[PDB]
Amino acid sequence: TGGSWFKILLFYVIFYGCLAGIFIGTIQVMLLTISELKPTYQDRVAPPGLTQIPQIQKTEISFRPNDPKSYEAYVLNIIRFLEKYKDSAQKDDMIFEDCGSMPSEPKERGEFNHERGERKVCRFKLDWLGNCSGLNDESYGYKEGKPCIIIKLNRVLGFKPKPPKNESLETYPLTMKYNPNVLPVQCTGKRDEDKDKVGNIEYFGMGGFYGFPLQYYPYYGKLLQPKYLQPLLAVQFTNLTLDTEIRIECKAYGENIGYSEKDRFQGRFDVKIEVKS
Amino acid sequence: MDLDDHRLSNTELEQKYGTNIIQGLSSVRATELLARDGPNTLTPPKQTPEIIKFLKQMVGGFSILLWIGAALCWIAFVIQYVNNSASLDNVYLGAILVLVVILTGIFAYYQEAKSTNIMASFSKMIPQQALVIRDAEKKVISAEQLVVGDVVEIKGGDQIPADIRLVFSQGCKVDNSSLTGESEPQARSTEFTHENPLETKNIGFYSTTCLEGTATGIVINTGDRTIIGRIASLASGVGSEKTPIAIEIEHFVHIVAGVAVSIDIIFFITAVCMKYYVLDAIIFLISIIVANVPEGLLATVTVTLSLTAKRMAKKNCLVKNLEAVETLGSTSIICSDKTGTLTQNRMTVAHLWFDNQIFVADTSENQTKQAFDQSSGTWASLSKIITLCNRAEFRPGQESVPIMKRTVVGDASETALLKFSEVILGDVMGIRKRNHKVAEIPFNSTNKFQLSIHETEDPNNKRFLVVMKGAPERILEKCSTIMINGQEQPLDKSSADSFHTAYMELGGLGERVLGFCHLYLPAEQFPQSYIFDVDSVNFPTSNFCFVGLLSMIDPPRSTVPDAVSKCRSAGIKVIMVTGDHPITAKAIAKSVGIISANNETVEDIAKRRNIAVEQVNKREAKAAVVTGMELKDMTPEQLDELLTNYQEIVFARTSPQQKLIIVEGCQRQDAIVAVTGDGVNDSPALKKADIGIAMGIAGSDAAKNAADMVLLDDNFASIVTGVEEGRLIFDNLKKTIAYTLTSNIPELCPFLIYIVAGLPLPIGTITILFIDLGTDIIPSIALAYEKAESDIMNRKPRHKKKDRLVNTQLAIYSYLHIGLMQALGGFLVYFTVYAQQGFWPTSLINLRVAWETDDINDLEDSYGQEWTRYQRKYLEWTGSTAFFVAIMIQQWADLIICKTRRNSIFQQGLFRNKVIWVGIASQVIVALILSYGLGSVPALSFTMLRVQYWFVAVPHAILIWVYDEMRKLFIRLYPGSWWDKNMYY
Ligand SMILES: Nc1ncnc2c1ncn2[C@@H]1O[C@H](COP(=O)(O)OP(=O)(O)CP(=O)(O)O)[C@@H](O)[C@H]1O
Ligand SMILES: *[C@@H]1O[C@H](CO)[C@@H](O)[C@H](O)[C@H]1NC(C)=O
Ligand code: NA
Ligand code: NA
Ligand code: NA
């Protein structure tokens, strides 16, 4: 009977409309507590993860230099990421500022407020990533057999890395360490045999320093600092044993930087490389 | 082994057993025999060991699903551990499932064992009595004290205590259903008839009851020696019965299991399509089955029965079947018997009618002789009739206490007449000794009179004095003359008018009236040596001499009127079916409340309007008083019409067959009937009725055996209490089912949202399993302890087919209101967690593919930050834990709102049921153990939660409570409206 069907359907219509209204109202009342500039908590992200650009599936880099298709995907991924680091895209001056090529103290651009609008960002030049920038050598070192991986630190909003103090040097001591404004990053062999057969490793950072400069921090969060360019570190493994499953572990050292056994990509990462013959 | 004295004559009985035929064995002989023979108790058969019941309880209900799920989880753990280390989570989940199924089985076993011990202990103190005769005196002793060789007298209604060889049977009929199989009246004869022990009628073989008459027997076998003890078939114990509530629950569990199977199949197909691991999808399948099925429902029904059995035990009652309570709670017609149930069953002579005059008497504490003169010839003849036709005898050895305190093992009316004759005249025993008796017909309901043949010792030696008593109307119709002033004269209209007006005066007080007459058989017709046969008519039964009437006070019980008022308030039709005259029955019904105030029958309407009875239409009369003959000559269609168109019905002058006809017609009206009876005449009605009720004291052994329930307190309010307990059982089961069905949607919905909208998985397999095993086991049991509401007995009886335990409206409510609201609260807390960590609600759309991609360790959130895969899986675990906590709090709200159906929580009380708070505290404990244990070390998709995430869903729980209270309030304020019709479950 339609006379009662209409009434019960009407009751259901108002009932579900009221339920949806309560749900939406509660969501909105929650969202007024959410800031658009600074996240409420950083429990899960505060220690930034350390990742690489080639974007390899199973933490494996497998390619034969003879066959271009073996490293075609890796080269395409690297160039696709590096498209935004070309000097053509950094030509603008209203948003991009040219800070010095020598590492310096982290620069504060103000508190996270809608006032002052969009902030300015330092420009990162590709020529600093020599031998792996692609400007001098297209397709990087995959043709010759000298793979390049670009190492980046995961973006954390309002994060200021603290490099290790001079008194306590957990990493390899260096005359050129320059700890006040460089976050050290070192790639070593995973185990004894890989350490023996890893070969020479050379690092390309700003001004020949090994790690991430500190003036590129803190990140302000895609709304005050869109088109942000995080510092990059290039690692080339030069000569390594052929037809060998070499495992490489790259680690970032610092006071804020932390490590966990559960998260294998927190403050460090693992790469497996075998160059087929 | 077949060695009996069936063919052996009565002469050897005295010599073989050394017991007298009448006096019997002496007390000293009984003492020595008791220490040598032993008690008369059958060997209790070994049914099943406790370990078998215990294992059955762990394999009873839905425990098979839990066992299979645990086995599959352990197999998956073994498979994944064969390859690599894998995760140590399937073994722990299986351990939890095994622990919970073991705990549920243990609880169910403990509850059913407690119920079984309670029912056995409260069905075992009732003793079987035997009327043994020792030293020419009869004393009532328990059947366990019976020995071999003694003489036992058994009449109608009492079960035969042992293998007795009958030596004196007067038309006695026995039911050999336990022996042969037939319930037909089997006549008994003293003479040896058949060579086979079973076929002969000179011996009864225990486990049988006498249908009518009296029988005297000699015990031959006791215990396992008798035929019923020889055969392995159980005389009593577990019968054949399946309660309709079991059918309803079994149908509900079947349909929910089927729907759960469809759901797990469809989710398993979708999960395989979405590229899950096979073992993971199988565990998800198992979680889908476990969550949907109502585990603990059988435990809940066991708890309800175990509680209500004890609740009726507090009211001093006996229930044979644990689930007869459910049938009693749905009773719509109560066919009660006036004498022995509605009244005190204690009676005293108060008024007497002879010589066209009503004589009053002192009810109690007379302390003086009667007012009326005893020298009158008419009263002397009446006293002689009372003394002769009566068979009652005072209890031997008790002639020191007053007359009323002395007990008799005969008819109650016979007892009262014996007391009156003893207090007004000399010893009745001496009169009976002087008046030699040759043959006598015991009172039977079919005849409605008692027939006796006596040898006259008067100078006018007629030698055959036929004295009868019984129904005044039949006796008057069988009498063509009445003695007035000691002189016989033909019956005239003046005597009839005086008798009728005196009878109305007696009946106006609700008193019972009996008729008494005598006649002297002529000497020419019957010589001194005459052979009398029961079948042969011989002496005429007509043209007797009327004498007068005697009135009998039968006061009712004090609490019966309140019980009747409650029953009529609950929509139960009370029908009085008695063998008394219509006038007294109507007076008693008016006094107690069977016939309501201002309610009148057709005769009352005709009297008050002074119009012809036939001219009066039948519709204006709301009450009727139907005689036995009118019902006897009444077709089934007419009886159905009579029961349909009348509110209050009183049946008078009824026979056992008439009671059976009434019961079967009331059944034909598709109504559940409860019949109360105490005598052997009530057995067919007791068996045919849906619920059988018998009196603890006034009831007979046959009535106790046939009844499905026994009132050891002998009050009508016990029936009201039993109906209330049944209604409470139905309400509590409905509440438990409604609560259980709520949580199905909060578990199924998140996976659907995950598949469709692409949000990261709001809930996992482990979290669904833990919600099931921590929110839908203990509270479901706790709802079985809920008390009855205030409107429990103000509701109409539920129709068997119209009203069902799980109707579609209950499922609609439980799924589409509470389930959806709980899911909305859980999703609110999920969105709160994700937004506070950095992922806004809009960014979570279609984020599923990138979320679980292990390749992407730099997922960009709404603020531009990059997230590692493990970090966002930890975020997923936190969201799942918050969803679990929200669902648990909303289940607290659902449990609060599910303990009532009409009244508010303020009327019922928040802390009345402490087991509700036990379950809530258990949920608090398990939530803390899950969030702070196994969350500090994140193993089972659980992590520690911040303090604010516990209180996010509290407003939604309060909203659930407010909405349910508003619905109940609008139902209460507007009964029978659209809201009441469509929003009531
Ligand atoms: N001991 C007795 N002696 C003589 N007449 C008796 C009697 N007991 C009953 N009657 C008569 O037999 C008639 C039939 O009544 P009946 O005995 O069938 O009612 P009832 O008392 O068995 C109903 P219930 O058993 O349910 O209380 C009555 O009218 C009564 O006068
Ligand atoms: C790296 O750069 C140096 C010059 O800075 C060059 O001599 C060398 O050949 C390069 N190595 C490779 C493997 O490209
Ligand atoms: Na369940
Ligand atoms: Na629930
Ligand atoms: Na459920």
Residue numbers in the entry:
A (entry chain B): 28 to 304
B (entry chain A): 52 to 1036
From the manuscript:
Here we study primary-active transport via P-type ATPases using functional and structural analyses to demonstrate that four simultaneous residue substitutions transform the non-gastric H+/K+ pump, a strict H+-dependent electroneutral P-type ATPase, into a bona fide Na+-dependent electrogenic Na+/K+ pump. P-type 2C ATPases are obligatory heterodimers formed by a catalytic α subunit and a auxiliary β subunit. While the sodium pump is electrogenic, generating an electric current as it extrudes three Na+ and imports two K+ per ATP hydrolyzed (black ions), the gHKA and ngHKA export H+ and import K+ in an electroneutral fashion (cyan ions). The exquisite ion selectivity and stoichiometry characteristics of these pumps are determined by their ion-binding sites, formed between transmembrane helixes TM4-TM8 of the catalytic subunit.
Addition of Ala797Pro on the SWC template (SPWC mutant) generates a archetypal Na+/K+ pump. A close-up view shows that the SPWC mutant binds three Na+ ions in E1, and two K+ ions in E2, like the NKA. Due to the weak densities at sites I and II, the Na+ at site III is the only one unambiguously determined, while it is difficult to discriminate the other two Na+ from bound water molecules. The densities were interpreted by considering optimal water-cation distances, hydrogen bonds, electrostatic repulsion, and the need for multiple oxygens surrounding a cation. This results in a close overlap between the Na+ modeled in our structure with those in the NKA crystal structure (offset, respectively, by 0.5, 1.6, and 0.3 Å for sites I, II, and III). We found that TM5 pivots at site III, where the Na+ located on the extracellular side of Tyr790 is coordinated by side-chain oxygens from Thr793 (2.3 Å), Ser794 (3.7 Å), Asp827 (3.3 Å), Gln942 (2.5 Å), and Asp945 (3.5 Å) and by the main-chain carboxyl groups Tyr790 (2.8 Å) and Thr791 (4.2 Å), nearly identical to its coordination in NKA8. Coordination by the main-chain carbonyls of Tyr790 and Thr791 breaks the alpha-helical hydrogen-bond network of TM5. Therefore, we propose that in addition to providing a mechanism for Na+ selectivity at site III by the size restriction as previously proposed, the straightening of TM5 is essential for the allosteric conformational change of the whole enzyme structure required for phosphorylation. Interestingly, our Na+-bound E1 structure of the SPWC mutant has a water-filled cavity that reaches Asp945 and is capped by the α-subunit C-terminal tyrosine residues in the intracellular side.
